């Protein structure tokens, strides 16, 4: 199940470090038991159910900060803060109740974040990336006016004051719900896994947005480079995560970034489709003896089954857009589309043996041409006209 740290048994840094480290080497999620202010914390959360309502006049900006109306009378209240005065992230939280929860979750979360880094991060220069003077936080509150959201946190760790209405993936596929109301829940983010350089891995979580969930995620300063081998920062990963969580907000504030992420899903789609089509066509060719190409409608159900989704004739035509010489697709005797492997060689097949690598290489090429051009980039691969 879930690793549990009892604070009445282990309370100081000397005791907690080997415990935290042993956990982090095999887990990304753990419970905090007997926290000295669990009662006060639970009282504050209870207060949020009837008072200190979300500021509906606040708006929701490009920093993914403010108040956002969701469906089913659910309200999101979120604040992203950074210690850097050069950054316009000045608000940690708003109302007295949320501020009290923040102060308790931060002091606790900052302590354990440093333990997490000390545990699985070898770089001495990264041992002090997070301090009381250098950090960034995201305080998230869901409010319900009387399904699960899947996300992958990107901080060092995310804390939940109550281990309730949250699902996770055991390290032993399938979601399992966590129901330990007397404990806080800790989950590590991708930054810790990344900086561990293989020592630690994390996993996505699931929450019920109608269960008044509160969470605090903690980072080093947002301007911190992810790695020496790149220019991407924590800000880039935070943005991508927030875009995936709130795509409609993204469509307004970050339309290009959204359309790229959507196009990448289309890329992933067409690559698997090609591999599936290769298998299906190869198998069908075995149940033949004469050079009569199969009608496309015959192949679709098998292709759809392997793709685990409905695949239409239009989808297969996307493959030709990426590589027109991939297949020979034409109308038959009775006006139905047929599909078969090419018989004759061209300059491509005379110089490249692998059909597998050929499609992948031309998929990325097509992908770059779209995102390098300044014309309105598409979110999908256009169907090749016959």
Author numbering: 14 to 159, 186 to 211, 217 to 430
Extract from the study:
The process of eukaryotic DNA replication begins during G1 phase with the loading of the minichromosome maintenance (MCM) heterohexamer comprising Mcm2–7 subunits into head-to-head double hexamers with double-stranded DNA passing through the length of a long central channel. This topological loading requires the Origin Recognition Complex (ORC), Cdc6 and Cdt1 proteins. In budding yeast, Cdt1 forms a stable complex with MCM before loading. To understand Cdt1–MCM at an atomic level, we determined crystal structures of two non-overlapping fragments of S. cerevisiae Cdt1 spanning amino acid residues 1–438 and 495–604.
The structure of Cdt1(1–438) was refined using two independent crystal forms to resolutions of 2.7 and 2.1 Å. The fragment comprises a pair of well-defined domains corresponding to the N domain (residues 14–298) and the M domain (residues 299–430). The relative orientation between the domains is preserved in all four crystallographically independent copies of the protein chain observed in the crystal structures, indicating a rigid linkage between the domains. Perusal of the Dali structure comparison server revealed a striking similarity between the Cdt1 N domain and Fe(II)/α-ketoglutarate-dependent dioxygenase superfamily of enzymes, such as AlkB and other DNA/RNA dealkylators, and the Jumonji C histone demethylase21. However, the key His and Asp residues involved in chelation of the Fe(II) ion co-factor in the active sites of these enzymes are not conserved in the Cdt1 N domain. These observations indicate that the dioxygenase structural fold was repurposed for a non-catalytic function. By docking the crystal structure of NM Cdt1 into the Cdt1 density, an MCM interaction can be modelled, whereby the middle domain of Mcm2 is sandwiched between the A-domain and AAA+ domain of Mcm2 and extends to contact the A-domain of Mcm6, following the outer perimeter of the MCM N-terminal domain. Conversely, the N domain of Cdt1 projects away from the MCM ring and does not appear to be involved in any contact with the helicase motor. The N domain of the yeast protein plays an important role in MCM loading, but makes little or no contact with MCM in our structure.
